[PDB]
Amino acid sequence: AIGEFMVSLPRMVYPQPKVLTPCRKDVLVVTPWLAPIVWEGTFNIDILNEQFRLQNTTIGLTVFAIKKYVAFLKLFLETAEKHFMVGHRVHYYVFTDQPAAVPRVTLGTGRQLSVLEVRAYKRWQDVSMRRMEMISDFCERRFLSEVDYLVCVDVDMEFRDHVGVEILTPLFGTLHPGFYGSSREAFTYERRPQSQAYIPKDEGDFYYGGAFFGGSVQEVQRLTRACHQAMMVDQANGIEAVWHDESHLNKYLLRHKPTKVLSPEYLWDQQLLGWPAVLRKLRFTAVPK
Amino acid sequence: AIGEFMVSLPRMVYPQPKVLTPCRKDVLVVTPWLAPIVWEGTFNIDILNEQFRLQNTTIGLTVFAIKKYVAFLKLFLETAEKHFMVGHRVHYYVFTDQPAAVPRVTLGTGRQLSVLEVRAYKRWQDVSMRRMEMISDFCERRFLSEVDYLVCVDVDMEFRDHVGVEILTPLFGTLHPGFYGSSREAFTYERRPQSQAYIPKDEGDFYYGGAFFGGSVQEVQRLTRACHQAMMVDQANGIEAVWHDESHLNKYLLRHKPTKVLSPEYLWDQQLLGWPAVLRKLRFTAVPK
Ligand SMILES: O=C(NC[C@H]1O[C@@H](n2ccc(=O)[nH]c2=O)[C@H](O)[C@@H]1O)c1cccc(CO[C@H]2O[C@H](CO)[C@H](O)[C@H](O)[C@H]2O)n1
Ligand SMILES: O=C(NC[C@H]1O[C@@H](n2ccc(=O)[nH]c2=O)[C@H](O)[C@@H]1O)c1cccc(CO[C@H]2O[C@H](CO)[C@H](O)[C@H](O)[C@H]2O)n1
Ligand SMILES: CCCCCCCCO[C@@H]1O[C@H](CO)[C@H](O)[C@H](O)[C@H]1O[C@@H]1O[C@@H](C)[C@@H](O)[C@@H](O)[C@@H]1O
Ligand SMILES: CCCCCCCCO[C@@H]1O[C@H](CO)[C@H](O)[C@H](O)[C@H]1O[C@@H]1O[C@@H](C)[C@@H](O)[C@@H](O)[C@@H]1O
Ligand SMILES: [Mn+2]
Ligand SMILES: [Mn+2]
């Protein structure tokens, strides 16, 4: 549950926070609207685990496996079992056009998986974009009654390290691994004023990755429905955003600031980008071609 | 209002956040439970003002002026008018045993003041401690219906610089100016196990000042009633905490982590402590003896 009476934390022994020592000297750890930017070294996971377990938090994880992308499910789910919200209640939601192609992955206690059959679109762009509509629709069908938070990710990925309750917040986006060091003018936002996703050269905080976002069910419903409705307007006007659902996500998060931002630890491609000094952990990474 | 449907921010032009540049190199700007620690340079006030104005936020400010402390009200209120939540709806609540001694201070538009008559206790310790009971009681009498957030401060103080919506959050405490650089063993927590305020030598995050705390009305009600009930248990057991209400506040905030922590910019004494390099602004300061 969220926003419900909270019991006291028990006695815990851990290192005292150091007021006169920055937790990172190489990166920004808070946005200008006071949202934490989540990097290794910013959080004590023992404190956070206590806070979230005392609230009996349930996390939903959505993934789309349409057409040939069913092949990615086995590694995705196996690695999620090792690294994603371990110790907490988890509900996996696999959206697919092939229910029989979902692998039988052995799950830890307190973790469950539901298969949600959906239609397949012909174009990969529409498969990607229509995730917004489908996530929004299911926020009523079951998410509101079943989970506290939703995490929405790409399937062609694997967990390599801890992804836990440090990410949970009303609304989060993730720094895109290709652009975290780029100036806003270089961001690949939609730049045509005719599109609902339009962002001018002098606006923008970050370039967020379409492959990893989430928050409370209420806030994810708002985000996904807003993006879907914006994509429908674009379609009526005969325009499709340069980076599809990701362009609209970026527009939404510019106008509705996330309450946490995840570092590129949480969305990476090692083949393409290596392992820079700024990343102490690689948590969730692209599966090589 | 809090937690209500939020409209989009308008287009704004401001400097892009720098992912690879820490906003401070000399201080901790986020707690290990991912609560922002509010220092100058961590926030863009233009973004925050937009977010809070769009929600039509009302802030209550409580102050106790009992017996001779009525003399501090004129400067306190005059300086609050220059520096506290300017542009937002404010409701001052002056608790006093002398309604006729409250100075007629000229208020800006959208700002109001209510005088709340209470009893005076003989001992200064009880005057200080019984603030918890009185704040808790009034959370029902009017605060729930009148304000979104409550800020609870000492009266023998003056505003010298901006104190605004950057502090607002469900629950906040403030780093005590005498101890922000101290190790936990040196903190003047209550150390007798017989007291409800007891904290062992190996526990504690920060030493919070009793002179400046707040949050949402719901969370302030919880804090103040918990501290009052704990003080009543102590009284029944013939013990009084070393630093009175401040000892209990520290116990509560250890077990219920605040969602923001304010730097000593927000609670200072220049006569006693000077003006260190770490403080870019002195916002709220003791009135010299
Ligand atoms: O991730 C993609 N789409 C977003 C998500 O949308 C879902 N999706 C998309 C299309 C689809 O047919 N089925 C499906 O389930 C699935 O969950 C995907 O993760 C996507 C779409 C087109 C191409 C690629 C991959 O393109 C490049 O990146 C890879 C990363 O290792 C490889 O380098 C690959 O060779 C390269 O083409 N991903
Ligand atoms: O602030 C105090 N109490 C907490 C609040 O409690 C309220 N209070 C307390 C007692 C009281 O009789 N009336 C009253 O309204 C008032 O709002 C106070 O701000 C307090 C209590 C005792 C002594 C002092 C001041 O002690 C020392 O600090 C001052 C800071 O400049 C001067 O240095 C002063 O000389 C020194 O004794 N403050
Ligand atoms: C100036 C430095 C230029 C170098 C930057 C290289 C990263 C580019 O990244 C692509 O960025 C696009 C937006 O502009 C889309 O988000 C696309 O999905 C993404 O490729 C995806 O994510 C990538 C990380 C890879 O895994 C790629 O294979 C994926 O298809
Ligand atoms: C090791 C360095 C030791 C040097 C530290 C000096 C600051 C001590 O501070 C006192 O701390 C107490 C708790 O231990 C109470 O909070 C007390 O109200 C406070 O004095 C108040 O606040 C102060 C800032 C002054 O304004 C003082 O006049 C007030 O009465
Ligand atoms: Mn992909
Ligand atoms: Mn005082």
Domains of chain B: 1-289 (3.90.550.10)
A 10 A CB-CB count for B36 gives 24
> Mapping DSSP to helix (H, G, I), strand (E, B) and coil, where does residue B68 land?
helix
Nearest to A183 among B16, B48, B206 (CB): B16
Distance from CA of B19 to the nearest CA of A (A): 5
- Cα distance between residue A5 and residue B211, in whole Å: 26
- Cα distance between residue B61 and residue B155, in whole Å: 11
Handedness of CA A143, A146, A147, A152 (dihedral sign): negative
Nearest to B42 among A14, A16, A34 (CB): A34
Query: Which of A6, A14, A19 to probe the B interface (max B CBs under 10 A)?
Result: A19
Q: Which of A39, A46, A92, A47 is nearest to A65 (CA)?
A: A92
A94 forms bridges with which residues in the sheet?
A63, A115
CB contact set of A173 (below 8 Å; sequence gap of 6+): A206, A208, A209, A212, A213, A249, A253, A258, A261, A262
Helices B244-255/B217-236 angle, 10° precision: 120
With contact defined as beta carbons under 8 Å apart, do B276 and B26 qualify? no
A 10 A CB-CB count for B6 gives 15
Distance (angstroms) between ligand 2 centre and the Cα of B98 equals 17
User: Per the structure block, which two tokens stand in for B166?
Assistant: 């950057």
> Mapping DSSP to helix (H, G, I), strand (E, B) and coil, where does residue B142 land?
helix
Distance (angstroms) between ligand 6 centre and the Cα of A206 equals 44
CA-proximal residue: ligand 4, atom 19 (nearest): B178
- Cα distance between residue B109 and residue B111, in whole Å: 6
A213 forms bridges with which residues in the sheet?
A152
Output helix, strand, coil percentages for chain B, rounded to the nearest 5: 35, 20, 45
With contact defined as beta carbons under 8 Å apart, do A135 and A262 qualify? no
Is A156 known as a binding-site position?
yes
- Cα distance between residue B177 and residue A246, in whole Å: 45
CA distances to B86, B101, B160, B170 from B53, in Å:
11, 34, 23, 17
Q: Which of A152, A172, A116 is nearest to A245 (CA)?
A: A152
User: Per the structure block, which two tokens stand in for B65?
Assistant: 């002026």
Answer whether A28 touches B (CB < 8 Å). yes
With contact defined as beta carbons under 8 Å apart, do B55 and B22 qualify? no
Distance from CA of B289 to the nearest CA of A (A): 29
CA-proximal residue: ligand 4, atom 30 (nearest): B286
With contact defined as beta carbons under 8 Å apart, do B98 and B197 qualify? no
DSSP chain A: --SS--PPPPP---PPP-TTS-S-SSS--B-TTSPBEE-TTS--HHHHHHHHHHTT-EEEEEEEE-GGGGGGHHHHHHHHHHHBSTTSEEEEEEEES-GGGS------TTEEEEEEE-PPPSSHHHHHHTHHHHHHHHIIIIIHHH-SEEEEE-SSEEE-S-B-GGG-SSEEEEB-TTTTTS-GGGS-----TTSTT---TT--S--B-TTEEEEEHHHHHHHHHHHHHHHHHHHHTT---TTHHHHHHHHHHHHS--SEEE-GGGSB-HHHH---TT-S---EEEPP-
A 10 A CB-CB count for B114 gives 13
How buried is A117 (Cβ within 10 angstroms: 0-12 exposed, 13-18 middle, 19+ buried)?
exposed
CA distances to A193, A225, A251, B8, B46 from B11, in Å:
14, 21, 11, 9, 12
CA atoms within 13 A on the CB side of A3: 12
B117 forms bridges with which residues in the sheet?
B96
With contact defined as beta carbons under 8 Å apart, do B90 and B58 qualify? yes
* A246 given a catalytic annotation: yes
Answer whether A22 touches B (CB < 8 Å). yes
With contact defined as beta carbons under 8 Å apart, do A256 and A223 qualify? yes
Q: Which residue has the tokens 């863009």?
A: B44
Answer whether A36 touches B (CB < 8 Å). yes
DSSP symbol at B172: E
Q: Which of B54, B61, B62 is nearest to B1 (CA)?
A: B54
Which chain A residue has its CA at the smallest distance from B263's CA?
A19
- Cα distance between residue B65 and residue B18, in whole Å: 45
Q: Which residue has the tokens 């104190």?
A: B163
With contact defined as beta carbons under 8 Å apart, do B205 and A14 qualify? no
Q: Which of A205, A23, A210 is nearest to B18 (CA)?
A: A205
User: Per the structure block, which two tokens stand in for B84?
Assistant: 């506290």
Which chain B residue has its CA at the smallest distance from A254's CA?
B9
Q: Which of B49, B131, B138, B130 is nearest to B91 (CA)?
A: B138
DSSP A69-91: GGGGHHHHHHHHHHHBSTTSEEE
Experimental method: X-ray
Q: Which of B163, B143, B137 is nearest to B228 (CA)?
A: B137
In what helix (H) or strand (E) does residue B247 lie, and over which residues does it extend?
helix B244-255
Ligand with smallest separation from the Cα of A175: 3
Q: Which residue has the tokens 């003989």?
A: B122
Quoted resolution (Å): 1.6
One-letter amino acid at B237 equals N
How buried is A288 (Cβ within 10 angstroms: 0-12 exposed, 13-18 middle, 19+ buried)?
exposed
Which chain A residue has its CA at the smallest distance from B6's CA?
A256
Is A211 known as a binding-site position?
no
Answer whether B18 touches A (CB < 8 Å). yes
User: Per the structure block, which two tokens stand in for B243?
Assistant: 């630093």
User: Per the structure block, which two tokens stand in for B208?
Assistant: 């919070």
